[model samples]
Target chain A: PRAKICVFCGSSGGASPAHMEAARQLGRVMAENNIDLVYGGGTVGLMGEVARTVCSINGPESVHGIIPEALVRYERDGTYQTVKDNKQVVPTETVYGRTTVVKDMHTRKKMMAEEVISGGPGSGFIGLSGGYGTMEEVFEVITWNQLGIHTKGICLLNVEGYWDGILQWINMAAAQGFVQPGNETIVVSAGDAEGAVRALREYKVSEATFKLEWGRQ
Target chain B: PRAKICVFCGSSGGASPAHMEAARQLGRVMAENNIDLVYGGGTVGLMGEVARTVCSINGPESVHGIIPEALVRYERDGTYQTVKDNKQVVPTETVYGRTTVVKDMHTRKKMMAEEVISGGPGSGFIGLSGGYGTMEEVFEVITWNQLGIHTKGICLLNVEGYWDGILQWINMAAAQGFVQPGNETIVVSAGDAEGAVRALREYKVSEATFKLEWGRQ
Candidate 1:
């Protein structure tokens, strides 16, 4: 069995066709690699597309999802619709894969991080096109990596430059002395699913990477 | 007494003189307005500048800082130096304002959030130029606003357009349908300290703002 990778993505399908395609392709690639899918539990937007595709290829048991109780209700009532016609185009089943519902957002995020690192070395995090929640999740993992909370690689599936701006911001931040020079290596970018998976599998901690001694303490 | 604002910044004084100047200016302004300062307790980089300035003006009791014990040790050891000569140029006393040492990062962040919102309506969050931690902290609050975890206004101290890239990304995400429109109002940006304080004081929930009912429940 391959390692489980926690995927951070949008609850919305997004406006770009390339983004949706990327999500499905990532799922296909992960399934092919026998990598289990770990994600926020919701059958909507890019999230649903990725989870459903992975389940179809690898079985629902191969995927694990964790969502907060409040989010479950919010999305179930169709309040999560990103676009006006999203509800009509997508199914809102309010269920997906083998899922766990937590009490709040913090719990859900904490659980996702735990699940991703639970498998140890091979396990990691993959980010797809997303909004505030997704961006924050990815950055949170990056911060954790910097603090040596975990040693997992973080890969961003940058489809059609969707995440280019964020990368630029990180680069600028590093240059401006806000981010330490070597610490920026905590995040790795990939243009496609194959590259993303490969990056994670071949990932090695950079020598310049600043690590905190706090995790074990 | 004005509402206590939670300030998120870096432990390193960034490369740009503008960033450091902005941090000091923000501190002075907050002090002038009698707005209590809430921040991560560390006498290093931009964090120290802001906290120290506030304390210098309003006294140490006017600022409340929370830091994880691990970080306290890290910064105390001068491992947080952002610039090569940062230690030579700045002090690293490891103590600042009315400080509270928490068990971990999670507790520190949780307590900071509580400190800001505990003031009720006028309390909010402010971001200055920083790295992974600062970016994630701002985005986390933005996500919380979207989820209606708290109805607090968030402002970014955009010194010399340092935060423009992230704002652009948010706008793009909204256009791409990854971010819900109107929900983007969760963050407000300002160029200086006075404007930041004004924005927070004058902030009103936009009519188009999407508020989740989860907060009250």
Candidate 2:
């Protein structure tokens, strides 16, 4: 593992073939750049695809999955790999050669942000096709970034126009004075794999734009 | 505090006066219904609005704020009553009657859901005008609820049609198969304070409809 970059993706693969295709390309790009992985531990869907591809090419142990015990309750619905009978008894341990079981969600996010190392180079989190979890992961880090907790790039892998609506929503917020102008600059959109990597590579430090001092309490 | 309910709102309170008005009303509604609050612990924007109204009505000691330390680094940007001072002290203590500082984003959400209590019955979370943080908080708890971690109600206090775009986006996700149709049931929306309280009052248990098993491994 050369460097670590956390990728936020969904456990469910999503509705578009291009979503998975982009995930595959992102995996290749990360490995091509010697980028290791940090993500939600799952052996199904998009997170699974990235992990499978990155681990296969870069060595299984190169990927680090920060999993939560609550997430493994797959018998309830079933996208998680713990219930994959074909890989029977694997649990989540075999999904990623390196897996960390966290007691809660914030722990998972912290581990991904703090434990996932960039080795002093530009490091960021990318959003893939996912539901709430993906956005939560993306926003918290970016909010922290906006607060100057950490200065890092956040990219939205806008495969098949997945993030278009959300992007518009942010801009709308900006126009409405909720989100500061160019605050959206903190998030760069990549239409494909190569674009995502390029955004991170060319990422610059953006100044905090949130009007945190609205009323002065 | 009898029971604590989570309130997710934006630090940057956007354009329409309705946003903060709705937040204030929601706080009043919570007090009327005998629900305490758990929020992001900010003193700005819609979040500040809710926290302010709740604290004032419920007597400061009734509100519980689960704030991230990283967020408190707001001196670099602004906002957050946690650091309000000249006392060279106070920190977040002066901001909320009760507070819990968590090290991770996931924990903040978890605290709202699990740690913060209703003390008795009918506890849940509500969303007002906000950015990523607000939605992230909503989605995670719903996701956890879908997984059956905790069976609490989640709501969107859609003010001035603030949540319509996100609603359409959600429907789009459902149409695209990324989300199940009835998953929307998990989130009930209301136009005003009384309506929100009514929704929470008559909130029925909704089943998790996510296609966790649409295609098996």
Candidate 3:
């Protein structure tokens, strides 16, 4: 089965070299396994690194980028203003793949989820180092899986122990009974890109997993 | 000006006595200051504790509970089945405040946000101890603040350091250049309910805060 993984990562590259290497490695490994890449459409930082790597390795058609209309200018014009300083955009000629410009971030995320898992198995979500937006993205899919909204795999690329803190939080949350103890394994973690993809490939839903009645909604 | 703060907490009573007490104290403190409460309309765990406390103190009209139609059955008739075991419903005669039933969880969150920060400045968001759902809710508002969608103060009820792990992650991300250093304080933490409220009342959006163009979307 051809897999398509939705990646949630930082728009800005981190201070560590391990972060950039991990992003590129993820794209390489996924492309090697003939898996597709679905991610935020940005030509900067780790987002662009992964997308570009996948496009170069597997061809542009293998990468799917979704950007909100509000942020499309950042991809096209190579410049956008922020509260602190103007972010320097990266110029890339490798954006020939499919790009979907949605109306808003909300729509972009909804569509990304649909593209990743709606078709069935061989789809999952991956999280790399990021800020609050990435944290929420990873947790949202984890929550969805916990609720039985989807049974796809969710993995965190733990580069240089970058995700150890979050993993600690999840474990502590389960121990406190806020999160069900059994459900603690809902998110799988790997130390690197190859391990991450392997984990996702071999993931399974727990037999005792509580399924929600989505149809009731 | 009267405030209506949105609270995100667990649907299950955590294993700690301090967790439950923190929820009740948060409600009492809000009502004491004539501030209203807005939250997930579930008659269980911290959600129920806070809502029940506020209603008992300031009257039902002081609390607004937005529940999705899907979960309304549990609020009314009680017991809801999960994959593990049927949850023991808490019988409460204290659900008399304004209850707005929406179509789904997505709509419920959207409505809750609108109710909290739409009308004005005094309103903010408070997070208590919980699992993935609560984590996502807290991060969503924080992400919104980062994107400049809303500038309302966000606070976390530490509840004997229950939120310490998450706070550590945020600080680590900032140090790693994932979260902007200046935005690290986007979520304020307090050791107790009174301090949480005081922090909210004294909250100010950072002067160097980056604002996004929401109207473009």
By DockQ, the best candidate is 1
Q: Rate the local accuracy (lDDT) of all candidates.
A: 0.79, 0.70, 0.80
lDDT of 3 at B23: 91
The candidate 2 chain B region of ten consecutive residues with least summed lDDT is B85-94
DockQ of 2: 0.42
Tell me which of candidates 1 and 2 scores higher on lDDT: 1
Report the C-alpha lDDT of model 2 over B1-217, residue by residue, as the tens digit. 3655777788887788878788888888887777777777756677777777777776767677776766555353233334434322112443444666677765676667775443445667777777766766677676776666776677788887777777766765666656655565777788887777676656655443434334432
lDDT of 2 by residue, A114-172 (tens): 85433446567788877766766787777777766776788999877778778877776
lDDT of 1 by residue, B119-188 (tens): 7556799999989999999999888788777878999989888888888888889889888877877788
Which is the winner by TM-score between candidate 1 and candidate 3? Answer: 3
Number of clashes recorded per candidate = 1, 8, 1
RMSD of 2: 6.7
Candidate 1: lDDT over CA atoms? 0.79
RMSDs, each prediction?
7.6, 6.7, 7.1
Tens-digit lDDT track for model 3 on B1-217?
5788898999989988899999999989989989888988767899988998998998868888877766655433532221112332323435535676677888788889888877456688999999999999999988888888787889998887788888888877888899976688788899988888887877878643434323333
Model 1 TM-score on a 0 to 1 scale: 0.85
Better of 1 and 2 by TM-score: 1
True contacts kept of each: 0.84, 0.52, 0.76
